[PDB]
Structure formats: C-alpha cells, structure tokens
Scaffold this active site. Structure first.
Site, PDB file in Angstrom:
ATOM      1  N   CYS B 105       0.848  -1.198   0.000  1.00 46.94           N
ATOM      2  CA  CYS B 105       0.000   0.000   0.000  1.00 46.94           C
ATOM      3  C   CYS B 105       0.885   1.249   0.000  1.00 46.94           C
ATOM      4  CB  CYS B 105      -1.078  -0.098   1.051  1.00 46.94           C
ATOM      5  SG  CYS B 105      -2.499   0.966   0.646  1.00 46.94           S
ATOM      6  N   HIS B 125      -0.080   1.466  -3.537  1.00 44.93           N
ATOM      7  CA  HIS B 125      -1.433   1.931  -3.751  1.00 44.93           C
ATOM      8  C   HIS B 125      -1.391   2.992  -4.851  1.00 44.93           C
ATOM      9  CE1 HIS B 125      -5.384   3.712  -3.159  1.00 44.93           C
ATOM     10  NE2 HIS B 125      -5.661   2.560  -2.580  1.00 44.93           N
TER      11      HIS B 125
HETATM   12  C1  LIG Z   1      -3.248   2.068   1.966  1.00 38.87           C
HETATM   13  O1  LIG Z   1      -3.543   1.137   3.020  1.00 38.87           O
HETATM   14  C2  LIG Z   1      -2.317   3.060   2.238  1.00 38.87           C
HETATM   15  O2  LIG Z   1      -1.255   2.904   2.826  1.00 38.87           O
HETATM   16  N1  LIG Z   1      -2.718   4.207   1.744  1.00 38.87           N
HETATM   17  C3  LIG Z   1      -3.975   4.052   1.251  1.00 38.87           C
HETATM   18  C4  LIG Z   1      -4.803   4.937   0.739  1.00 38.87           C
HETATM   19  C5  LIG Z   1      -4.410   6.308   0.555  1.00 38.87           C
HETATM   20  F1  LIG Z   1      -3.338   6.330  -0.005  1.00 38.87           F
HETATM   21  F2  LIG Z   1      -4.274   6.941   1.648  1.00 38.87           F
HETATM   22  F3  LIG Z   1      -5.259   6.970  -0.175  1.00 38.87           F
HETATM   23  C6  LIG Z   1      -6.069   4.504   0.344  1.00 38.87           C
HETATM   24  C7  LIG Z   1      -6.465   3.199   0.516  1.00 38.87           C
HETATM   25  C8  LIG Z   1      -5.552   2.315   1.038  1.00 38.87           C
HETATM   26  C9  LIG Z   1      -4.347   2.761   1.423  1.00 38.87           C
END
Ligand SMILES: *[C@@]1(=O)C(=O)[N]C2=C(C(F)(F)F)[C]=[C][C]=C21
Ligand SMILES: *[C@@]1(=O)C(=O)[N]C2=C(C(F)(F)F)[C]=[C][C]=C21
Ligand SMILES: [Cl-]
Ligand SMILES: [Cl-]
EC number: 3.1.2.-
Lengths: 187, 187
Positions: B105, B125
C-alpha cells in the site's frame, strides 16, 4: 443518524474475519463497537493476533440495539459464541426487532445454537456445513455471500471483503458500498 | 528450521494489511513477530482497531535477523515507519544480507525514505505512486503483487491475501502456499 454495528469478539475468533468487517464498516461511516465476549480485556484470536475490544459485551449491550450484529468465525470463536447466553439474548432481540444479523465462516453455527433464523438460506465455510445443517433447519448455499430474511452469511477469510461490503450495502446503500470498495484495490 | 517474519507495527498502520499477512504467514508455519515500533504497548491502527504487539521493535531486533521484514501500509503508519531510524537500520541490514523485504500500500514509501532497493520494480497503492516515484528511483508497476531483487510489493487491502501468499511462496514454496490458500475461500 449513523448506522451502528456490534461485532462480538470471542477468544479464538478469526482475526481476519473480525478486522476486515470492522475496518470496511468504519470506512463506510458506520459506528462500530468491537465488544469483548469475556469482558474488557484483550482477546487472543485464532492465529494469536491480540485485539483490544472497545468495550465488554455487557457494556455494549446497554448501548443497543444495533443496525447489525456481526459474528466473526474461527471454529473456537464460534464455539464460544454458541455457548454464550449473552449472545443468545442479543441475537433473539435483534431477530425480534427484524434487524440484520451477519455471520461468517463457522460464525453461522452460533445461529443454529441459539435457534436464530430457522428456515433461512445460509452459507458457511465448507468444513462447517455439516454442523450448520444438523437437523436441516436451514437451507444450504454455496454462494460466497448469502442473504435471506434477517440473515446475511458468508464463507471464509477470503470472502470477508464481500461480506463486509454486503453489510455496508444493506445499511448505507449501493452507492456508499461502491465508494468504499474502490480504494481497496479488490479484484 | 522454521522461517521467521518480522512485521513492524506503527500507529496508523492499516489493520487489514497487518492482520492478513500475520495470519496467513502463521497458517504457513512461519514464526511471526508482530513488533511495536513505539514499544511494547498496544497500537491504534488506522481504523481504530487496537492490536497488542508480541514485542517491542527494540526487543525483536535482538532476535534477528529474519527471513522477511514486512511493512504494512496505512498512510500514517508508513509515515511513522519512514521517520524511524530503527526501521532504517533493520532494512539496511536485511538488504545487506540479501533477505526478503515486503511492503504494501503506502508501506513501500518507507523503502524510499530509507534508500532501500533503488532500481527495483515496485508497486504501491495508486494514491501513493507519486510519493514513491519522487526522483524516479524505482520503476513503477501496476501489478497487484510485484517482486524484483530483494523487494516484494503490493497495492492495498484488497491485495493483502495475494501479498501474503507471495511471501509464503518465497519462504516455504509453491506447494505450501497452495495448501494454505485452499481453506481461505479466495476467489
Ligand atoms: C493504503 O492502506 C495506504 O497505505 N494508503 C492508502 C490509501 C491512501 F493512499 F491513503 F489513499 C487509500 C487506501 C488504502 C491505502
Ligand atoms: C473459518 O474462519 C472458520 O470459522 N472455520 C474455518 C475453518 C475450519 F472450519 F476450521 F476448517 C477453516 C478455514 C476457515 C475457517
Ligand atoms: Cl479456525
Ligand atoms: Cl490510510
């Protein structure tokens, strides 16, 4: 007003089946209470992840009723849920008020134990089918998520996102469920 | 001897991205240590799930090295990992010994912060791509799981099972990964 979810957390709960719905429901703006069956203390899940509940079940019950009562799986977690008179009372109340009841993996077997939702179409983990079907009180389904009457069921860790999003759709609608789904990077 | 995994758990970690790999790795017979960045105390994850770590990072480091170091995502968790000198030291050691490093992510952005694995093909991500790619130090991929050199990356909560099973395959082989996968009821 925001919708409210009660997630009942017992020793031996499957931690993935607990955390995925809690997280996804909170992404949907649902107020979720992670309630410790045994009390306020941390809970040792099936694969040894230790989760600190928001409240004891005893206390969380005082703040009911809820728009959904959620029963994670894990064989030993589901057995603990099945043995609990407090769970029985919560599920009977929820059934009486025509509220949503959601259970995953072996979680649905607690519905059998507490005589909840007889006649409904249900799924479970494949290895929990025979237990669930003892007496033929439900109709079995192999759908990854199933919903009949009050009763929303699903099969395993790998169906937890689908299960959680079905809860979201039931409470908050299709649009919110789609909005919440997109950033998850589901297949 | 069993393979060993270090999962570094910081405030604001995505709880699904933490729990899914821990659980799946333990199903694979990997000895997993959930290590608290801040110390021994419980950790408030991104969606307010509170997880009690197995050990502090300080203590877990003394028991290294590990076959894999795992960095969950969550934007604020990844930021905490990125800011930590202790994480830097652990990742540099792991890189120096040619050991597996896995991040999901926003987790991979901590690799950038600590100057780990430059030149590798990576995913993140979608909303973390620009951060990861600042300076063009990696080559970007849209694969749900990516692996290049020492570095195994993945995209989000919805790719967590695939990520975890890739770790299992790297440590314990294809056969064990398939055995562990089947009872999960993945699609
Ligand atoms: C994810 O778990 C992360 O680390 N960032 C993230 C986002 C974001 F980037 F913040 F928008 C969105 C969904 C999942 C994750
Ligand atoms: C599931 O989480 C559950 O409650 N039971 C279960 C099994 C079983 F039934 F024990 F074999 C296997 C995988 C997942 C689950
Ligand atoms: Cl289980
Ligand atoms: Cl986040």
């Amino acid at each position: 007003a925001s919708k409210r979810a009660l997630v009942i957390l017992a020793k031996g709960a499957e931690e993935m089946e607990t955390v995925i719905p809690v997280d996804v429901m909170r992404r949907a703006g649902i107020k979720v209470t992670v309630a410790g069956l045994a009390g306020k203390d941390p809970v040792q899940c099936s694969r040894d992840v230790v989760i600190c509940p928001d409240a004891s079940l005893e206390d969380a019950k005082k703040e009911g009723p809820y728009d959904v009562v959620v029963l994670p799986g894990g064989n030993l977690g589901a057995q603990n849920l099945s043995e609990s008179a407090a769970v029985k009372e919560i599920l009977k109340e929820q059934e009486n008020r025509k509220g949503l009841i959601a259970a995953i993996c072996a979680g649905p077997t607690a519905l059998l134990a507490h005589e909840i939702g007889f006649g409904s179409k249900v799924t479970t983990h494949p290895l929990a089918k025979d237990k669930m079907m003892n007496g033929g009180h439900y109709t079995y389904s192999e759908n990854r998520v199933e919903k009949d009457g009050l009763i929303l069921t699903s099969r395993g860790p790998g169906t937890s996102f689908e299960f959680a999003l079905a809860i979201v759709e039931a409470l908050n609608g299709k649009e919110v469920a789609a909005q919440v789904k997109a950033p998850l990077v589901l297949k």
